[PDB]
């Protein structure tokens, strides 16, 4: 009831699919798309006169077959369109009907029925016959009520055999408000306060008269439904939870939607606040009229698009903040008007007219709207039963004319043929309808089976600061945590500066080496083997010993020689116990430290590459024969998909992302000893065309021999899948040279820090790795997700189960040589994102038992 909506201003969402029998559609309005404004006896409308005095169409009237083909491509269950009143009755009164206009709409309705497309027909989408404006004053004159009912009666008689869904008026708020308040819409009066509310009143009474007409004379034998399309914006308090601001949001909504919806869907009178403030000009419903206004709509038809947000004077905002939150608007409707059945009769946004077919932003607007609708259905139990995408094709957009585009199909208005070319949004919406929701195409069923008996089950930690072995208190708590898990392997990182404070071996800190040796030997007593990372750089902790840092760090090739000496010391002091080594963690995501220029990023990375290869060759010559372990490095290896999967430039950007992320280091070390060709060619071209000053330095034949073949296995840190689009960026930094922007996909599960849970990404990655680098042994050395929960971490449990299914699918089905999985990470720190299996107070989270269960079963047998 009135006021209940004010409450709206005060887990895991695993739904992709809309209810069975959800009704998918698309809409146009006659003025926007028909053209032929004076062909075949059509009379002029107030918009024809308004365009000709205040301000090449889609030509649907002559290209009806091209529109029907577009509908077939999309695959809608319904098509919403309006009848042009002056095309049927040139003078509005029901004297002789224009025969060619009747034939046009009749042919359209027949063609829809033959294609199994339900028509939804709007009697009035703003094109009042000019003759009625000039003779009577249009909606200002209440003789319009019988004149409009006469027109509707004819339409029920000629078309209602074939039409089961009727809309009387599209968005009456804008007819009154822009037609007579702002002057932005036909007939273009501005400031006429009395007319604004007199017009609103005759629109409401006309609607009600037509409803009773349909209800008594046509519904018994035609068995359809009739409503009216009410539009509104959404709004949020200008101060976050201020009660006076919330009170004003309610008033903003009441003033736009309540004005027409309280009489029709509510108690049958205008809202109380409006009656008081406007008791002046607001006409009065008699008590008999109130009982005849309410309940005159068989469902709630709701419009939510750019006409209720732009221009800025469209609504009284009461000082508050406009918002595109469709989910909240639907909840307000549910509260205010007592849980009605809802058709989304118009929803969409717009682009500039220069956007032709690649409308990425329309896809992401639709993703957001559709995700909000799905939430409203599933979480809020709002009875949305159908959805009208707007609009079918580009047309005339009112005062904006042809400077914006709203179609799912592109139309070149300067060509004679006006061919309807499907935009990206058309392909996307077509797939929405096919899957009745968001695509499952990349998801496969759970597989049954098991990992090898010698699969490495791991957990990861980052840098352990050094503190009998039981002396060190840090070690006790690590053992208590590992003893609660069934891992066979533990990954942790040393602190180079703790081991070698000066960088020189003559000044080794032997206490630090004793601490790390205790971690390993105590772990072995639990039956857990160590994988030891020598160097784990982060944005907060570069990890270099101070004298190397002040000698220019990784821009000084001497830093690589000092790393070789550090590595040898660790092999000597730990390598009888440690058989798995990572030289460097994610050197390819340490381009955030030497971010000055691209040349800096590429130069530092070159020295990191040399560091790794020097340590690897030292190990291979001097320590492998007596120790028989294995050495590699961990590559940051998120997956990438095109943001817009219907834009060829985004498929190229996805492959380019993998080139700059993974092949950058994997090509030299694994395969050729040199940088990937795609990356060097791309940077060169951007340099050749004057846009970047970056060069990827050429590698001597000697340096290529040093680097090639220096890994014993492939180690990958995989967390998520990024969605990427091509964009020519400015500057000569690393992120500029790769020409990539990122989008978040609202339709997928994600974490408090926006990490997307895309389980099939890891399978695609493992294929890409084997396709480009051969049948190497692969370890996933880090995999995980932050989760806000402190004990019942359901997102981590979901992540673990779904990603491990895809790993096992990579193993059983794709035959990838996957040898280990290390979960990230053992414990979280107090004010960092919560990746830990254990809380910062070493409390166990519920995902431990799930991971133990998978380890015990060796998968999902």
């Amino acid at each position, epitope marked *: 009831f009135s006021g209940d909506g004010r409450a709206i201003w005060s887990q895991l969402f695993l739904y992709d699919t809309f209810p069975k029998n959800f009704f998918w559609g698309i809409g146009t309005g006659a003025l926007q798309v028909e053209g032929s404004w004076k062909k075949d006896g059509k009379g002029p409308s107030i918009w024809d006169h308004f365009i000709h005095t205040h301000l090449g169409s889609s030509d649907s009237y002559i290209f009806l077959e091209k529109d029907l083909s577009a509908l077939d491509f999309i695959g809608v269950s319904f098509y919403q369109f309006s009848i042009s009143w002056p095309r049927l009755f040139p003078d509005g009164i029901v*004297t*002789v009907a224009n025969a060619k206009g009747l034939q046009y709409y009749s042919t359209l309705l027949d063609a829809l029925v033959l294609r199994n497309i339900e028509p939804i027909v709007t009697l009035y989408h703003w094109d009042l016959p000019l003759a009625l404006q000039e003779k009577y004053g249009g909606w200002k004159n209440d003789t319009i009520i019988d*004149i409009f009912n006469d027109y509707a*009666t004819y339409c029920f008689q000629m078309f209602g055999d074939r039409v089961k869904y009727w809309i009387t008026i599209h968005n009456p708020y804008l007819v009154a408000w822009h037609g007579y308040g702002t002057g932005m819409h036909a007939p273009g009066e501005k400031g006429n306060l009395a007319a604004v509310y007199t017009v609103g009143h005759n629109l409401i009474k006309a609607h009600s008269k037509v409803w009773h007409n349909y209800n008594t004379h046509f519904r018994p034998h035609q068995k359809g439904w009739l409503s009216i399309t009410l539009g509104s914006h959404w709004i949020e308090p200008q101060r976050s939870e201020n009660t006076m601001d919330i009170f004003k949001c309610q008033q903003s909504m009441v003033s736009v939607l309540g004005w027409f919806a309280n009489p029709i869907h509510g108690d049958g009178d205008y809202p109380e606040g409006m009656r008081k403030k406007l008791f002046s000009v607001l006409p009065i419903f008699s008590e008999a009229e109130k009982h005849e206004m309410r309940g005159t709509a068989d469902f709630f038809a709701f419009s939510f698009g750019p006409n209720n947000f732009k221009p800025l004077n469209t609504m009284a905002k009461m000082g508050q903040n406009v918002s595109l939150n469709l989910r909240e608007a639907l909840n307000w409707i549910k509260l205010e008007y007592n849980n009605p059945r809802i058709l989304i009769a118009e929803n969409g946004w717009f682009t500039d007219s220069r956007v032709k077919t690649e409308d990425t932003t329309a896809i992401y607007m639709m993703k957001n709207f559709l995700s909000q609708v799905l939430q409203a259905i599933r979480l809020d139990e709002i009875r949305v039963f159908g959805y009208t995408a707007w609009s079918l094709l580009d047309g005339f957009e009112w005062q904006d004319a042809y400077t914006i585009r709203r179609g799912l199909f592109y139309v070149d208005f300067n060509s004679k043929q006006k061919e309807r070319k499907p935009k990206s949004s058309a392909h996307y919406y077509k797939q929405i309808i096919r899957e009745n929701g968001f695509s499952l195409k990349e998801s496969t069923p759970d597989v049954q089976g098991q990992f090898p008996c010698d699969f490495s089950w791991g957990v990861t930690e980052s840098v352990l600061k050094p503190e009998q072995c039981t002396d060190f208190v840090n070690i006790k708590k690590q053992l208590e945590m590992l003893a609660r898990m069934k891992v066979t392997h533990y990954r942790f990182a040393l602190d180079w500066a703790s081991v070698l404070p000066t960088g020189q071996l003559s000044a080794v800190n032997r206490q630090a080496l004793r601490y790390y040796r205790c971690v390993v030997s105590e772990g072995l007593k639990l039956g857990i083997s160590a994988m030891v990372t020598l160097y784990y750089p982060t944005h907060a902790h570069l990890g270099l010993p101070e004298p190397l840092l002040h000698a220019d760090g990784w821009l000084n090739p001497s830093t690589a020689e000092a790393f070789q000496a550090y590595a040898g010391l660790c092999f000597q002091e730990l390598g009888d116990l440690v058989k798995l080594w990572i030289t460097i963690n994610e050197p390819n995501r340490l381009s955030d430290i030497y971010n000055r220029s691209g040349n800096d990023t590429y130069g530092a990375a070159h020295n990191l590459l040399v560091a790794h290869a020097l340590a690897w060759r030292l190990y291979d010559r001097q320590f492998r024969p007596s120790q028989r372990g294995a050495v590699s490095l961990s590559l940051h290896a998120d997956w990438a998909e095109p943001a817009n999967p219907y834009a060829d430039s985004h498929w190229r950007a996805a492959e380019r992302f993998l080139q700059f992320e993974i092949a950058w280091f994997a090509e030299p070390l694994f395969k050729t000893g040199d940088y990937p060709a795609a990356m060097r060619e791309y940077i060169a071209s951007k340099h050749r065309r004057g846009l970047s000053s970056s060069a990827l330095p050429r590698l001597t034949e000697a340096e290529r021999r040093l680097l090639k073949g220096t890994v014993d296995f492939c180690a990958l840190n995989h967390f998520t899948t990024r969605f990427v689009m091509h964009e020519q960026l400015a500057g000569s930094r690393y992120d500029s040279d790769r020409d990539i922007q990122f989008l978040q996909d609202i339709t997928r599960l994600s974490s408090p820090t926006r990490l997307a849970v895309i389980p099939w990404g890891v399978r695609k990655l493992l294929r890409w790795v084997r396709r480009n680098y051969g049948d190497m042994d692969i370890y996933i050395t880090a995999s995980g997700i932050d989760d806000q929960a402190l004990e019942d971490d359901r997102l981590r449990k979901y992540y673990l189960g779904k990603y491990l299914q895809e790993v096992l699918k990579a193993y059983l089905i794709d035959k990838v040589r996957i040898k280990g999985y290390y979960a990230f990470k053992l414990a979280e720190e107090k004010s960092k994102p919560r990746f830990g299996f254990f809380t910062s107070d070493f409390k166990a989270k519920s995902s431990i038992q799930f991971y133990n269960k998978v380890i015990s079963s060796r998968g999902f047998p």
Partner: nanobody
Amino acid sequence: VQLVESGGGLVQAGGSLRLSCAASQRTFSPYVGGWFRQAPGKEREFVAAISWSGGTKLYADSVKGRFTISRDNAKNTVYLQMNTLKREDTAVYYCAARRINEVLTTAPDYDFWGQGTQVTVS
């Protein structure tokens, strides 16, 4: 539907009459109410018609300004108020009904007809 006229009769020139047509329908639906008139041996002549909700009314030019057509859907009745009657108005008056809500002026457009009632202006 059956249509039944009444109100005809004999009136002095310059006088006035009110004809009415009551419709009875076994499936009550909307209709256009029409009035035609016929002198003996002459063709049937359009007089006035009215749309279902009364927004459209048409009149023959010989009758504009003198005759007024109206309707009361609750009573299923269409009314013809005839003022300033002339001798040339003497005729049999026929009410007529057309289902499609489109106000037309020729006899073949009307599906249903009353028996007719005599109007005599002496």
